[PDB]
Design a protein around this ligand. Structure first.
Ligand SMILES: [Mg+2]
Ligand SMILES: [Mg+2]
Ligand SMILES: [Mg+2]
Lengths: 94, 197, 117, 101, 127
RNA sequence: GUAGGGGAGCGUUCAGUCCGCGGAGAAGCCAUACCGGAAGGAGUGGUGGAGCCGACUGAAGUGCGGAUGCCGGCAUGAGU
RNA sequence: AAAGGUGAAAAGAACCCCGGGAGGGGAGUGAAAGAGAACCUGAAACCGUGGACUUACAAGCAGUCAUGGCACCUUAUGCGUGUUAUGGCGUGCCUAUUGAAGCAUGAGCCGGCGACUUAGACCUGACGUGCGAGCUUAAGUUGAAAAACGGAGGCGGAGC
């Protein structure tokens, strides 16, 4: 989201911005802002009681993009590469 | 700090360049050596002048689309090579002391590995060549190394024509290039190898 | 020595001429026009990266006030409720709830109505 | 057998600061080098003058230069260097070479 | 398979029901008009349409079609009442460039375009 | 960030050195979704049919979209 | 002016088939004819045939971002690759200029050719190295699968 989840997900291995806890099963606990676990809907701080459990699957570089910039009649042309670093996390929590 | 091979066993002499050799100074040397050897032949009719072509064309205005003088400019296919190569030098005078420091420093490199001082090829007998290979075999000269022979014996030289081995160098007319170019230095004839200044 | 262009230009040219895919007419076939098109494409590329971010939030907001109005409210009011119920800090996700979970969306409308009036 | 870098003729290094690369006129497209008008592919507007201060300044002067002497300082003889002796050939050999004057 | 070197000695390349009229002194677009009516038609219809199309490209085209027929039968064993124009196309040969004089001194170039008329016969077979 | 100044580098030919590769397929050409922060670089396959990559160092006729630029080929107007 | 290239060797394709011919298809030679005499490679512009997805209520610097549909699976199955509908956004490039989409300049397209160099015992500065209160050779001479010699002279060294 803004980094570090929330919500009633399931057992999904999603991709988020780098977490620092290097290598497999580095274990991550999430704050939680809403949930539909057992159809029961609860939001903010009342959801804060509950938490999500994640397992750091992998560390990777997101598909290469190219940062291109151009200004006319000023002879301004720019070319630079980019790859965004992520941390893949397996969800398996409350 | 170096011994001998055939004829005696002294050697020991010479205050060889400090510290553990400088590549930068050898670099300065080789460059100069190759710069001097470089022939200055530069095949180019650079000038709009030098190429074979007339002088007026297809009038200044109203021909509709052009503005040209004559068929000899560098913008023309077949014209001059404006800024092309012309015969020149690249030979310069590398300071004396740096040339002296050069080969001394280069010899030092051969001391830190495989150096070789000899007194006469009485171990040769005629030119024969087959017999130079025999002598070389006795002193670890198998052919796995490129070798430089610096002898004044006109016959021991004559027994140097072979492959991945030797380049034969006369009357202490040595080179920082030649010694670095080969793996081992058979410094041999101890004429320049001892006594100067 | 002489050092003619040979191979360098054609390679330089093929690179550009391959970025030119579903480029109409000359824009995909002739170098100068293919290349020229790309300068302008660069403007669109760098701009549309930060633009999609306005584009989506727009779509997000539209879906919110649609559902907010389904339960006699509106985006302006609803959001203030969730803001006034400091506890509620969905912001991101909030549009999907309206669109997929109507049961859940209603709960958040009802909470928003409290924190307000 | 394996791949080897090896030291010698190929291990000879530049020297760091020894010699940098020249100026080839295209560091980006936006190089239409020199000025932007009146700085032209011509053979010099010149660099001196003939009013730009030099003229408009005075003198008839008169130049001469008859005889100029070699300065043999006292500190050279004194302080250090024990009397090897002056004469003519010895002062030269020690350090005061010049001729003609 | 083996490698290229081998393949070249192993499988030697055939052109079944193919014939080409090369360097035909006629403009491609002009010739294409005729060839366009003959594509997909049964070799017999092709032979007949050609005898009645009033364009001068008809003759050369017809000549290729008969050669493609012959080739299909003789060199390829194929059976005739099964034959049809699988493919036909006109490619451009080298242009004969000639200089025409014009008013007030100027000259122009006439392009005398040539054609490579190739037609490919195949056996139809519904099944 | 324009003129401009300063820094680090990519690529081409030639050269000296070293490591190699090649008719069980070299250069060049062609395709590609891979790599590098960019100039760029590699893998695989296809063609080709006899030469060539990599690393360090050296030297340049070393990088093109423009010049009513030059040479050449081919389009448009037009089946007019 | 421009124009080079079969193959190792002419073994330069007897004979057959369509055609007046040109041209082709076979057979044979050869490693290859994916070398056939418009003979090495054979880019690109340009002209075609075939297939995929598409288009006959549409307003357009021709892309770009987003989503849906169809197709495909050899760095390539969550990853895309191709293509396509609709939405948003969007004033070619260069030059010249206070001010360019400009109805201001240039340009039909592609390929190749095509512009900051070289010289001087020159001047002045940065870096670098060698000797260092000193540093250095020029013409030449002798050896040259190579460099050594040569101190005439030049610069520090006192200024007014
Ligand atoms: Mg010429
Ligand atoms: Mg042009
Ligand atoms: Mg004007």
């Amino acid at each position: 989201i803004q980094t570090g989840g929330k919500q009633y997900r399931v057992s999904e291995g999603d991709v988020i911005r780098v977490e620092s806890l290097q290598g497999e099963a580095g274990d991550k606990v999430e704050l939680k802002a809403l949930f539909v676990g057992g159809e029961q809907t609860v939001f903010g701080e009342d959801a804060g009681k509950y938490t999500v459990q994640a397992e750091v699957v992998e560390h990777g570089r997101g598909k290469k993009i190219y940062i291109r910039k151009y200004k006319s009649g000023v002879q301004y042309r720019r070319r630079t590469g980019h790859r965004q670093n992520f941390t893949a996390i397996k969800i398996l929590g409350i | 700090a170096q011994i001998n091979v055939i004829g005696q066993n002294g050697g020991r002499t010479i205050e060889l360049p400090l510290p553990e050799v400088n590549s930068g100074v050898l670099h300065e040397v080789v460059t100069w050596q190759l710069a001097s050897r470089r022939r200055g032949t530069a095949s180019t009719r650079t000038r709009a002048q030098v190429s074979k072509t007339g002088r007026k064309m297809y009038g200044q205005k109203g021909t509709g689309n052009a503005r040209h003088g004559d068929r000899s400019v560098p913008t023309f296919v077949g014209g001059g090579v404006a800024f092309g190569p012309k015969p020149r030098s690249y030979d310069y005078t590398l300071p004396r002391q740096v040339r002296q420091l050069g080969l001394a420093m280069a010899i030092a490199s051969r001391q830190e590995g495989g150096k070789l001082v000899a007194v006469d090829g009485f171990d040769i007998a005629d030119a024969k060549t087959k017999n130079f290979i025999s002598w070389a075999k006795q002193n670890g000269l198998d052919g796995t190394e490129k070798v430089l022979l610096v002898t004044d014996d006109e016959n021991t030289r004559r027994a140097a024509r072979n492959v991945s081995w030797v380049s034969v160098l006369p009357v202490a007319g040595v080179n920082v290039y030649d010694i670095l170019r080969h793996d081992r230095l058979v410094i041999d004839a101890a004429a320049l190898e001892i006594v100067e200044e | 020595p002489r050092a003619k262009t040979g191979i360098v230009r054609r390679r330089r040219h093929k690179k550009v001429l391959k970025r030119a895919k579903g480029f109409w007419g000359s824009r995909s076939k002739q170098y100068r026009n293919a290349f020229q098109t790309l300068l302008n494409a660069a403007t669109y590329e760098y701009r549309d990266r930060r633009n999609k971010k306005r584009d989506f939030r727009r779509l997000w907001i539209q879906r919110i006030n649609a559902g907010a109005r389904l339960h006699g409210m509106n985006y302006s009011t609803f959001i203030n409720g969730l803001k006034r119920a400091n506890i509620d800090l969905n912001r991101k996700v909030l549009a999907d709830i309206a669109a997929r979970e109507p049961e859940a969306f209603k709960a958040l409308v009802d909470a928003s109505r409290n924190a307000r009036q | 057998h394996d791949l080897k870098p090896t030291p010698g003729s190929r291990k000879d290094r530049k020297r760091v600061g020894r010699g940098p690369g020249g100026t080839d006129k295209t560091a980006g497209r936006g190089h239409k080098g020199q000025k932007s008008r009146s700085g032209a592919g011509k053979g010099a507007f010149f660099e001196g003058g003939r009013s730009r201060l030099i003229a408009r300044l005075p003198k008839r002067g008169f130049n001469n230069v008859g005889t100029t002497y070699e300065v043999v300082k006292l500190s050279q003889l004194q302080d250090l260097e024990d009397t090897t002796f002056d004469r003519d050939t010895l002062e030269a050999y020690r350090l005061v070479r010049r001729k003609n004057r | 398979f083996r490698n290229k070197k081998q393949r070249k000695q192993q499988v030697k390349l055939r052109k079944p029901g193919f014939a080409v009229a090369k360097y035909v002194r006629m403009s491609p677009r002009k010739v294409r008009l005729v060839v366009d009516v003959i594509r997909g038609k049964s070799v017999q219809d092709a032979e007949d349409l050609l005898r009645f199309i009033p364009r001068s490209a008809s003759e050369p085209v017809a000549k290729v079609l008969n050669s493609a027929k012959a080739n299909a039968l003789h060199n390829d064993e194929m059976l005739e009442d099964r034959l049809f124009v699988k493919e036909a196309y006109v490619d451009a040969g080298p242009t004969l460039k000639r200089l025409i004089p014009r008013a007030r001194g100027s000259a122009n170039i006439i392009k005398k375009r040539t054609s490579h008329i190739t037609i490919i016969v195949a056996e139809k077979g519904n099944k």
